[PDB]
Amino acid sequence: AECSVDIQGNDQMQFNTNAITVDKSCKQFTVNLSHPGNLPKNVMGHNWVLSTAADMQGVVTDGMASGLDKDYLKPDDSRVIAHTKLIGSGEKDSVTFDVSKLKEGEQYMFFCTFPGHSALMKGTLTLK
Numbered sequence: 359a360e361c362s363v364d365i366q367g368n369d370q371m372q373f374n375t376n377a378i379t380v381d382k383s384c385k386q387f388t389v390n391l392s393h394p395g396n397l398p399k400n401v402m403g404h405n406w407v408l409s410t411a412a413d414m415q416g417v418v419t420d421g422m423a424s425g426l427d428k429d430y431l432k433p434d435d436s437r438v439i440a441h442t443k444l445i446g447s448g449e450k451d452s453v454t455f456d457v458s459k460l461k462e463g464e465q466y467m468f469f470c471t472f473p474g475h476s477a478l479m480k481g482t483l484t485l486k
Protein backbone atom coordinates (compact mmCIF):
# COMPACT_ATOMS: atom_id res chain seq x y z
CA ALA A 359 0.00 0.00 0.00
CA GLU A 360 1.64 3.21 0.89
CA CYS A 361 5.03 2.03 2.11
CA SER A 362 6.13 5.50 3.14
CA VAL A 363 5.03 8.33 5.32
CA ASP A 364 6.23 11.96 5.30
CA ILE A 365 6.41 13.47 8.81
CA GLN A 366 7.10 16.99 10.14
CA GLY A 367 8.51 18.06 13.51
CA ASN A 368 8.02 21.72 14.49
CA ASP A 369 8.91 24.47 16.95
CA GLN A 370 5.80 23.68 19.01
CA MET A 371 7.24 20.25 19.72
CA GLN A 372 4.66 18.69 17.47
CA PHE A 373 4.64 15.89 14.91
CA ASN A 374 1.97 16.35 12.22
CA THR A 375 1.02 12.68 12.58
CA ASN A 376 -0.27 10.65 15.51
CA ALA A 377 -0.99 7.33 13.83
CA ILE A 378 1.04 5.26 11.40
CA THR A 379 -0.29 2.15 9.71
CA VAL A 380 2.23 -0.19 8.10
CA ASP A 381 0.68 -2.40 5.42
CA LYS A 382 1.71 -6.03 6.00
CA SER A 383 2.36 -6.16 2.22
CA CYS A 384 5.32 -3.77 2.32
CA LYS A 385 8.72 -5.48 2.49
CA GLN A 386 10.18 -2.21 3.78
CA PHE A 387 8.64 0.94 5.19
CA THR A 388 10.04 4.45 4.97
CA VAL A 389 9.62 7.53 7.15
CA ASN A 390 10.61 10.91 5.71
CA LEU A 391 11.13 13.35 8.56
CA SER A 392 11.47 17.08 8.04
CA HIS A 393 11.80 20.13 10.28
CA PRO A 394 9.81 23.19 9.11
CA GLY A 395 10.70 25.14 12.27
CA ASN A 396 13.36 27.85 12.80
CA LEU A 397 15.08 26.43 15.86
CA PRO A 398 18.40 24.50 15.73
CA LYS A 399 18.57 20.88 16.82
CA ASN A 400 20.27 21.70 20.09
CA VAL A 401 17.13 23.48 21.35
CA MET A 402 14.38 21.93 19.23
CA GLY A 403 15.95 18.84 17.72
CA HIS A 404 13.68 16.11 16.44
CA ASN A 405 14.12 12.50 15.57
CA TRP A 406 11.67 9.74 14.77
CA VAL A 407 12.36 6.67 16.88
CA LEU A 408 10.40 3.44 16.80
CA SER A 409 10.00 0.80 19.52
CA THR A 410 7.27 -1.36 21.00
CA ALA A 411 4.80 0.75 22.98
CA ALA A 412 6.28 -0.97 26.03
CA ASP A 413 9.94 -0.13 25.39
CA MET A 414 9.28 3.55 24.75
CA GLN A 415 9.90 4.84 28.30
CA GLY A 416 13.32 3.26 28.84
CA VAL A 417 14.42 4.35 25.38
CA VAL A 418 13.33 7.94 26.05
CA THR A 419 14.81 7.91 29.57
CA ASP A 420 18.22 6.51 28.56
CA GLY A 421 18.20 8.61 25.42
CA MET A 422 17.96 11.88 27.33
CA ALA A 423 20.93 10.78 29.45
CA SER A 424 23.08 10.12 26.38
CA GLY A 425 23.49 13.68 25.10
CA LEU A 426 23.17 15.55 21.81
CA ASP A 427 26.35 14.07 20.33
CA LYS A 428 24.59 10.71 20.62
CA ASP A 429 21.31 11.97 19.15
CA TYR A 430 19.66 11.47 22.51
CA LEU A 431 19.78 7.73 21.99
CA LYS A 432 21.60 5.28 24.19
CA PRO A 433 24.30 3.64 22.11
CA ASP A 434 23.52 0.16 20.94
CA ASP A 435 19.99 0.25 22.46
CA SER A 436 18.28 -2.97 21.24
CA ARG A 437 14.78 -1.67 21.84
CA VAL A 438 15.17 0.75 18.95
CA ILE A 439 13.59 -0.93 15.94
CA ALA A 440 14.44 2.03 13.68
CA HIS A 441 15.38 5.68 13.95
CA THR A 442 16.17 8.78 11.92
CA LYS A 443 18.95 11.04 13.17
CA LEU A 444 18.23 14.15 15.22
CA ILE A 445 17.47 17.14 12.97
CA GLY A 446 17.04 20.89 13.35
CA SER A 447 15.41 23.70 11.35
CA GLY A 448 15.61 23.28 7.59
CA GLU A 449 16.94 19.74 7.84
CA LYS A 450 15.51 16.42 6.68
CA ASP A 451 16.20 12.71 7.06
CA SER A 452 14.65 9.39 6.08
CA VAL A 453 14.71 5.93 7.62
CA THR A 454 13.80 2.69 5.91
CA PHE A 455 13.33 -0.49 7.91
CA ASP A 456 12.37 -4.12 7.20
CA VAL A 457 8.67 -4.73 7.79
CA SER A 458 9.62 -8.21 9.07
CA LYS A 459 11.05 -6.56 12.21
CA LEU A 460 7.41 -5.90 13.17
CA LYS A 461 4.70 -8.37 14.15
CA GLU A 462 0.91 -8.14 14.09
CA GLY A 463 -1.07 -7.35 17.25
CA GLU A 464 1.82 -5.81 19.13
CA GLN A 465 1.46 -2.07 19.55
CA TYR A 466 4.34 0.21 18.56
CA MET A 467 5.12 3.82 19.39
CA PHE A 468 7.10 6.38 17.44
CA PHE A 469 8.55 9.30 19.31
CA CYS A 470 11.25 11.94 19.59
CA THR A 471 13.92 11.38 22.22
CA PHE A 472 15.02 15.01 22.58
CA PRO A 473 14.57 15.90 26.32
CA GLY A 474 10.90 16.41 27.16
CA HIS A 475 9.61 16.12 23.60
CA SER A 476 8.17 12.61 23.83
CA ALA A 477 5.42 13.97 26.07
CA LEU A 478 3.84 15.77 23.04
CA MET A 479 5.89 14.26 20.21
CA LYS A 480 4.79 10.64 20.11
CA GLY A 481 2.36 8.44 18.29
CA THR A 482 1.07 5.04 17.33
CA LEU A 483 2.32 2.54 14.73
CA THR A 484 0.59 -0.75 13.97
CA LEU A 485 1.16 -3.56 11.50
CA LYS A 486 -2.05 -4.04 9.54
Ligand SMILES: [Cu+2]
Binds near residue numbers: 361
Ligand atom coordinates in the same frame (compact mmCIF):
# COMPACT_ATOMS: atom_id res chain seq x y z
CU1 LIG B 1 1.80 -0.30 -2.43
Ligand SMILES: [Cu+2]
Binds near residue numbers: 403475
Ligand atom coordinates in the same frame (compact mmCIF):
# COMPACT_ATOMS: atom_id res chain seq x y z
CU1 LIG C 1 11.78 16.57 19.18
